[PDB]
């Protein structure tokens, strides 16, 4: 799924990364800085777009599904850990929508 992994890097990641709401998702959740003592107990698989970018760039993925899985994990972590209405959740939701739009245009192969 190299064409799809190219799509995930150059179209999907590129678009989300440049978004005004990307910045809390560009690096791993800083639970120290953010005073989230429980984060690294409740969240079993931390994920962020910074990590996904590195995976796309360093030939981590064997197929596009694994990458789409990572994006989903990142959004899920946000939705299972955060409070409905809070800015972080409103930000995750707008990114997820753009993500899903770009994923529905995923090139065949």
């Amino acid at each position: 799924q190299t064409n799809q992994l190219q799509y995930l890097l150059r179209v999907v990641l590129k678009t989300l990364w440049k978004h005004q709401f990307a910045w809390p998702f560009q690096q791993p959740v800083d639970a120290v800085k953010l005073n989230l003592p429980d984060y690294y107990k409740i969240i079993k698989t931390p994920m962020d777009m910074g990590t996904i970018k590195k995976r796309l760039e360093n030939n981590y993925y064997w197929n596009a599904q694994e990458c789409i899985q990572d994006f989903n994990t990142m959004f899920t972590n946000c939705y299972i850990y955060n409070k409905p209405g809070d800015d972080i959740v409103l930000m995750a939701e707008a990114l997820e929508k753009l993500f899903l739009q770009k994923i529905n245009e995923l090139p065949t192969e």
Partner: peptide, 10 residues
Amino acid sequence: AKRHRKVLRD
């Protein structure tokens, strides 16, 4: 549980 304001307001 990460309750910080993030989104700029006017």
